[PDB]
Design a protein around this ligand. Structure first.
Ligand SMILES: *C(=N)c1nn(-c2ccc(C(F)(F)F)cc2)c(=O)n(CCc2ccccn2)c1=O
Ligand SMILES: *C(=N)c1nn(-c2ccc(C(F)(F)F)cc2)c(=O)n(CCc2ccccn2)c1=O
Lengths: 301, 301
């Protein structure tokens, strides 16, 4: 068959997406059991966004100030709390549709699905990847804050991402479900320096592996290369350096294709040095680093 | 914010995805109300796949031969029927989770979401587009037949696509929910000629429009061009010819950007003639034709 960027199915998460409004500000929350998780900066007014004192602002806000609507269902707040950058608004009504869920902090390179919501209603779903500058590139208009990113292995939903802010650079930053930001970012309207963005080399190999499986074998060179010397090429082109754990996770892909991992590193060396000269892999003229090895096997088998 | 290929949320469709097995063959069905829709060729054995006589095979098969499982729920068949290339297996249990749905036949160029299922369980969701050879490029492994494509405007699910077969060419063909194939294809294991695949010019303009909105304005040339003479460029490069209906549907995008439609056709003329010379729009070194004008506005506003 074929290879496309595929999101996990979204239903288990849609019935967790509520509407959260404090004062004049409206953003999405995540209602799991009897707690509704949402970004802190819901309690900010425009004036406080340079550097708000969140503690002080929360002191002022009231449980009745916190307004939770699950669609046309109307939830009522019985507690409030600040875990790092998130608020936990305890409620009376527990969710009948709470899935088996875990809170997980993802590592750079990992991919997840994003359910983009506005005003508590889901609008669309798309696959993102966490990057080595701990930023994500996604679609987030005004009001999309609170939208969550998640993986579904087996029956379990593993929430890893709550969106908070767009950066002046156009990329997006956010936190895990315990409220800590990925990367150095803070929930202030400050200029914040994202760092250099290094391509997930193990992902690009896995994509190329998914190409040989799906009928694209032009890049396959008769050559080979060494891990140390591939990485010299890698650092030149700002590619994350390959390790043996990387080689090992590609093992299952190595076997089915019967193309050794170092052989593919050599095909990737020429593609970096000689570019593409006008051909395409899997329908792209760019090297693609947002498919993990896991993403490929799940799609290609 | 940003621009990504976004699928519609999938929950309303997941709870319609059942398991359908006839004889030794297992594929997915779509259970709406008291009818479970699935591809005909479920009733084929390997020997009959050159050119099966479907009528005759259905005569032989029995209601009890038709086995429907909604996850661990067990549905029981009380009728059977052949509408073109689909079977309608009436059942006793109506779906408690049937959404407000319509059956629609899409026109070439239109985009929809695909819920990829195996054995009745959804695995992933991704955006496809119907193309002018009436084929789709997607991810469809063995057992994915019966997976459906759909749009969700408002609260209504508009099913347009049931997958049936992969072609020897690697692309995918299927039917509407009334069973008629898009394009000239038949449910036979024959070599079948897909035709020439023309790029949806109105989609590529809409994508470029979505780029100016999202901070990519390098392609914007100070030039202009004529509809007749742009189309001369279009036919050279095998691009679907632009009409005034096309220009009109881009009106809302023309206004917000303040870039006339013919100006963008001129930027597209140079990109076709001079290529990209190594730059990228929206993260791609290819011209993208699987965003309708509707897809762009829904994402960019
Ligand atoms: C997402 N829902 C959203 N988030 N912010 C926002 C608020 C505060 C911070 C802080 F700096 F404190 F971290 C970061 C990001 C928004 O400002 N907006 C814009 C709301 C809006 C309303 C009307 C017109 C324009 N914009 C958000 O949507
Ligand atoms: C999808 N579920 C699927 N469909 N076909 C298939 C069957 C019949 C036709 C016809 F020509 F009649 F139109 C087209 C397509 C499949 O053949 N398979 C393969 C099943 C399989 C099982 C074990 C090992 C390999 N393949 C499908 O999966």
């Amino acid at each position: 068959s074929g290879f496309r960027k595929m999101a996990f199915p979204s239903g288990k998460v849609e019935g967790c997406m509520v509407q959260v409004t404090c004062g004049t500000t409206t953003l999405n929350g995540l209602w799991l059991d009897d707690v509704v998780y949402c970004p802190r900066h819901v309690i900010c007014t425009s004036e406080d966004m340079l550097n708000p004192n969140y503690e002080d602002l929360l002191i002022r806000k009231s449980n009745h100030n916190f307004l939770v609507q699950a669609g046309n269902v109307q939830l009522r707040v019985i507690g409030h709390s600040m875990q790092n950058c998130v608020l936990k608004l305890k409620v009376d009504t527990a969710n009948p549709k709470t899935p088996k869920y875990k809170f997980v902090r993802i590592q750079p390179g990992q991919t997840f699905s994003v359910l983009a919501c506005y005003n508590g209603s889901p609008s669309g779903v798309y696959q993102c990847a966490m990057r080595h500058n701990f930023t994500i590139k996604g679609s987030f208009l005004n009001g999309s804050c609170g939208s969550v990113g998640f993986n579904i292995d087996y029956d379990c939903v593993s929430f890893c991402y709550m969106h908070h802010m767009e950066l002046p650079t156009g990329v997006h930053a956010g936190t895990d479900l315990e409220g800590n930001f990925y990367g150095p970012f803070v929930d202030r309207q400050t200029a914040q320096a994202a760092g250099t963005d290094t391509t997930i080399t193990v992902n690009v190999l896995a994509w190329l592996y998914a190409a040989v499986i799906n009928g694209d074998r032009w890049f396959l060179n008769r050559f080979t290369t060494t891990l140390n010397d591939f990485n010299l090429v890698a650092m030149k082109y700002n590619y994350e350096p390959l390790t043996q754990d990387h080689v090992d996770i590609l093992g299952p892909l190595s076997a089915q294709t019967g193309i050794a991992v170092l052989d593919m590193c050599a095909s990737l060396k020429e593609l970096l040095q000689n570019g593409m000269n006008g051909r395409t892999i899997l329908g792209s003229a760019l090297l693609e680093d947002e498919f993990t090895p896991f993403d490929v096997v799940r799609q290609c088998s």
